[PDB]
């Protein structure tokens, strides 16, 4: 995020980090329950990648994070990589995340849920802070 | 869901 601000450690308990085998952060994700993570189809996650929960500072070695294995990758069949439409992937975890003060689920809306233009929302992540 | 134990400060 460009022009963002550092968050309060653990205040976005659903925010996960997708990391490859080498420890490289490549995409964000959100826990929707203990066994499932929602992410972007285009992140191209495989079962060799790891889900990291309860993390704040990727630099620290003293935080109590959960490194969760991926059991299966569910790419929405409607996903059109050409148009990047319906860009969603579900990740089914091998071991269930342990909910704590720093790891919990975000709520999903109903299909009829209305989010009007002008509504202030929030986005989070470890993406570049400067291009 | 969607109620953090540690409140975000925006």
């Amino acid at each position: 995020i460009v022009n963002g601000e550092e968050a309060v450690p653990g205040s976005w308990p659903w925010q996960v980090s997708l990391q490859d085998k080498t420890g490289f952060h490549f995409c964000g994700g959100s826990l929707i329950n203990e066994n499932w993570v929602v992410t972007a189809a285009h992140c191209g996650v495989t079962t060799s990648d790891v889900v990291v929960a309860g993390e704040f500072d990727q630099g620290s070695s003293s935080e109590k994070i959960q490194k969760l294995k991926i059991a299966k990758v569910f790419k929405n069949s409607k996903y059109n990589s050409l148009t990047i439409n319906n860009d969603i992937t579900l990740l089914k975890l091998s071991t269930a995340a342990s909910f704590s003060q720093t790891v919990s689920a975000v709520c999903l809306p109903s299909a009829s849920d209305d989010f009007a233009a002008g509504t202030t929302c929030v986005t989070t992540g470890w993406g570049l802070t400067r291009y | 869901c969607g109620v953090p134990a540690i409140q975000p400060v925006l």
Partner: protein, 96 residues
């Protein structure tokens, strides 16, 4: 250029109609735009959330999908519209 610590940013939702001024025909029904307010999602942010507080709870409204190749803070970010995909998420969770 990658942060060790988790970042956050407040941003407004736009209408698909209004987002088409920036992205034209690239905006489909299953997409929702946000930003163009001095902030921007950037490389590495993808797959993450766009949440809106409602009736007191944070609700997943979008998924960081695509945007400006330079993470321009004056152009809208594109997110997967969760309302259009929630039924599939529910069918998938049910069945697995």
């Amino acid at each position: 250029n990658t942060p060790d610590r988790l970042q956050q940013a407040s941003l407004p939702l736009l209408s698909n109609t209004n987002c088409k001024k920036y992205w034209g025909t690239k905006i489909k029904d299953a997409m929702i735009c946000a930003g163009a307010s001095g902030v921007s999602s950037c490389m590495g942010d993808s797959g993450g959330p766009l949440v809106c507080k409602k009736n007191g709870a944070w609700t997943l409204v979008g998924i960081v999908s695509w945007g400006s190749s330079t993470c321009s803070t004056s152009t809208p970010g594109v997110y997967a519209r969760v309302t259009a995909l929630v039924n599939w998420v529910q069918q998938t969770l049910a069945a697995n």
